[PDB]
From a paper:
HDAC6 is a structurally distinct microtubule-associated cytosolic deacetylase, harboring two tandem catalytic deacetylase domains2,3 and a zinc-finger ubiquitin-binding domain (UBD).4−6 The catalytic domains interact with dynein to transport aggregated proteins via microtubules to the aggresome for degradation,7−9 whereas the UBD binds free C-terminal diglycine motifs of polyubiquitin or polyISG chains associated with protein aggregates or other cargo. We previously identified and characterized the first small molecule binders of HDAC6-UBD, which can displace the native C-terminal ubiquitin RLRGG peptide from a narrow and deep pocket within this domain. These compounds have a carboxylate that mimics the C-terminus of the ubiquitin substrate and an extended aromatic structure that forms π-stacking interactions with W1182 and R1155.
Residue numbers in the entry: 1109 to 1207
Amino acid sequence: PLPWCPHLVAVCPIPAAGLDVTQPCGDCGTIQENWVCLSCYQVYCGRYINGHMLQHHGNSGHPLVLSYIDLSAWCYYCQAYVHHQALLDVKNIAHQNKF
Ligand SMILES: CNC(=O)Cn1c(CCC(=O)O)nc2ccccc2c1=O
Ligand SMILES: [Zn+2]
Ligand SMILES: [Zn+2]
Ligand SMILES: [Zn+2]
């Protein structure tokens, strides 16, 4: 992945409730291929399901989303995966909830 991107500044603190990697899409309710927004921690489906996270990006501008399938982080602006020290806490919390 990219080792940095200029949107990591928009990654917000993890809610104290933690993450729920089985949370369904906030729009369509699908259990499949959901992502969590690393700005506001809403959960929406991937582009191969109904594209609600892509829609969320379009109407919020929020840059970085984490996959509940493989804990990769995508930046919609950079059109790339990004991994940095600043993402370890949220990935670690997701990994603990998933496994
Ligand atoms: C399996 N990983 C992905 O699909 C990564 N990804 C993603 C991930 C986030 C998503 O599916 O909304 N979004 C894109 C949006 C427009 C264009 C490309 C992409 C993109 O390649
Ligand atoms: Zn959806
Ligand atoms: Zn968001
Ligand atoms: Zn970026």
